[PDB]
Amino acid sequence: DFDSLSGTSTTWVNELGSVMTIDVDRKGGVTGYYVNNATGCRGLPYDLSGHAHGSTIAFSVVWSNGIADCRSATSWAGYARKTFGGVQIVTQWSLAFVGKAGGKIETGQNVFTYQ
Amino acid sequence: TDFDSLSGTSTTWVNELGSVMTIDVDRKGGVTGYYVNNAGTGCRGLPYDLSGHAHGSTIAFSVVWSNGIADCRSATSWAGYARKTGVQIVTQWSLAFVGKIETGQNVFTYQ
């Protein structure tokens, strides 16, 4: 349950080796940071914010940190899935970026495992 | 113009389903405000908090559908870009509920 992360800091990794550390407060506020391993802005920390309640969570990263700006933003929505024994976050992500052709939106799936 | 131009401002946007959001962009591009689902659906006609971040021409924000009044056991995230046509935000959304995931597109029109 995301309410069980109240007052904790936890690190999670997805199938690409992208990592996030999320702090969930007593009201379900989510702060932390994300390191992308996919793409541009690889290996640098980006600020992350969102919210969790019950079995669902959502969080956002803008890919600009004052070092590398990938002219893009990603948001994730997910649900908690308990594993034999652990808990994973099963997400769908939305990506927006501005390139030569202007704005483009993309989508995919990411599963985050608790470390 | 782009989201940097909204720093220190509060603005209202309406999507093609007639749902409404108000976004407050702080001086560092933090986004806070409220979302009202008007679609059909649960958690309808009540403000939910939204949070996210904006920089340049892109924005990302999310809503967890629990506000201490109605809980729809779900979370929606949007990522989008600002487009001049009027100014619109073209978004892709992801919705996670119960566990299942749905996706779609919303276009928000500045009021």
What does this structure look like?
- Chain A contains no helices and eight strands.
- By secondary structure, chain A is mainly beta.
- The first copy, chain A, has one domain (1-115).
- In chain A, a hairpin with a 4-residue loop joins strand 2 and strand 3 (29-35).
- Chain A is globular and about 45 Å long.
- At the A-B interface, strand 4, strand 5, strand 6, strand 7 and strand 8 of A face strand 4, strand 5, strand 6, strand 7 and strand 8 of B.
- It is classed as unknown function.
- The entry lists the keywords avidin, biotin, high affinity systems, unknown function.
- It forms a dimeric assembly.
List keywords for this structure.
homodimer; 115 residues; mainly beta; eight-stranded antiparallel β-barrel; 8 strands; 0% helix; 67% strand; globular
Concise account of the structure shown:
Chain A is mostly beta strands. Chain A has strands spanning 8-13, 19-24, 29-35, 45-53, 56-64, 69-82, 87-99, 102-114. The first copy, chain A, has no helices and 8 strands.
How much β-strand is present in the residues of chain A? Answer: over 45%
Order of helices and strands of chain A: EEEEEEEE
Biggest interface and which pair forms it?
A-B, 45 and 46 residues
What spatial form of chain A do the alpha-carbon principal axes imply? globular
Total of helices of chain A: 0
Radius of gyration of chain A: 14 Å
Span between N and C termini of chain A? 16 Å
For the largest beta-sheet of chain A, the strand count, sense and barrel status come to: 8 strands, antiparallel, barrel
Number of strands of chain A: 8
Number of domains of chain A: 1
What's the helical proportion of residues of chain A? under 10%
Oligomer: homodimer
Q: Provide the structure class of chain A.
A: mainly beta
Placed side by side, the strands forming the largest sheet of chain A appear as 1-2-3-4-5-6-7-8
PDB class: unknown function
Keywords: biotin binding protein, avidin, biotin, unknown function
Assembly: dimeric
Entry title: The Crystal structure of short F46Y agroavidin - apo
